[PDB]
Amino acid sequence: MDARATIPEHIARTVILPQGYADDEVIYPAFKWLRDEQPLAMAHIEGYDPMWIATKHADVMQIGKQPGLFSNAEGSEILYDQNNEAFMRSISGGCPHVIDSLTSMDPPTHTAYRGLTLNWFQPASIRKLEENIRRIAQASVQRLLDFDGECDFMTDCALYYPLHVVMTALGVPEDDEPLMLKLTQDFFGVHEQSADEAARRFHETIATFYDYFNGFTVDRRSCPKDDVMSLLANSKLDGNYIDDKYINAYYVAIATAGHDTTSSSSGGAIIGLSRNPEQLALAKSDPALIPRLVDEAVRWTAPVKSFMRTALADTEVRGQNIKRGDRIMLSYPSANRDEEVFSNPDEFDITRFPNRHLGFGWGAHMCLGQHLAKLEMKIFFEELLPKLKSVELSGPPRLVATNFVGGPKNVPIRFTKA
Ligand code: HEM
Ligand SMILES: CC1=CC[C@@H](C(C)(C)O)CC1
Ligand SMILES: CC1=CC[C@@H](C(C)(C)O)CC1
């Protein structure tokens, strides 16, 4: 048990473990204490590696923008306990990355693979999806309106539109919805068999998904389209096609990254608006505010609770001596309530501007999908809000108990139709 750990065990447990993330009033006060008293310090709790907890907005940016010093590739970029990490390595040829996605990479590899789609995901390219996104948003709004004034905003509505959007961006047909839900909800969901058994199911299931995706790769090499599958399928590096393992990991990364985060942030927006009806009234009388509503939903929800980095050299941050090999947890939620940046950060306020939140991260790995996420949420709220006279919560929201991709999973609401 590492001599440098100074974070009290009860605080360290609260910020590291998955369970506390199910309650805002458990997690945020723990980060507040850290920001006030031990803004960048080391924690070591049973079953986890020792790790620095980056709680300050400044620090999360400084770390995120220096991938040559603070690595995604060297350790697990995801916060696993040791048993889970060991399992992951045992099914991944010793690597602490289950697939070859962008978040598993460091420059220059990372730069090359990110660069394959970087232009596609810029605003002017994404803007062309507007009409498709708007049709998809209207269908989800219609799903909600088919209820007689009562539903679960997540499971009856917000679960769907962001998956359809990622599907449209990839090129996956609408009829493959069941398969895509299995992908993001079952196979890569959080689950709140011996070891050899779970390993067998994993290898068999990922092969099934990769075989499915390969069919698209092949198809798009003969019949190109303006989708991401086609872009990746027809991409070359050093005069050759990209290996299937990178292509298929890219498809998976796009679907998994872009589904829950967007859905959860949408749920957060609904929670904010239900607790602050004056803001619903404002977004409805001034639709030009919706982009600020969207950014506030992402700040306040912060569905991505963490990513990890490993220090590749001895170095200094906020006066602390970070040593080669030390792991660091980046807390986007804590950065997003940093009092040095935001006033009254616990308040949901759609007028907040500027809104320099880290819900999409910062630096070399900053969310590839951010522009698509902002566009689709904007369009969704543009279509939903005129249709609602009022919305309120009918009971407590249920948040995912995870230290990774969390936020609202169930948001029971009542509403009146406009
Ligand atoms: C509100 C919705 C979303 C949130 C909060 C979110 C958040 C994040 C965050 C925090 C990261 C890590 C950034 C870092 O290390 O600095 C990330 C990476 C990524 N996100 Fe998003 N995301 C969202 C929507 C999407 C969408 C719609 C896509 C669709 C393509 C997407 C694709 C990605 C990819 C591919 C990466 C890895 C990029 C890399 O490693 O270079 N995300 N996202
Ligand atoms: C490896 C993996 C971890 C998280 C998954 C989730 C829950 C975000 O879909 C996506 C992919
Ligand atoms: C937000 C996000 C969740 C999953 C990551 C992974 C593990 C697919 O690279 C990509 C980015």
From Swiss-Prot:
It is found in: Cytoplasm. InterPro entries: Cyt_P450 (IPR001128), Cyt_P450_B (IPR002397), Cyt_P450_CS (IPR017972), Cyt_P450_sf (IPR036396). Heme binds at C367. Pfam families: p450 (PF00067). Gene3D superfamilies: Cytochrome P450 (1.10.630.10). Its cofactor is heme. Its EC number is 1.14.-.-. CDD domains: CYP142-like. It comes from the Bacteria. Belongs to the cytochrome P450 family. Catalyzes the hydroxylation of alpha-terpineol. This is Cytochrome P450-terp. The gene is cyp108.
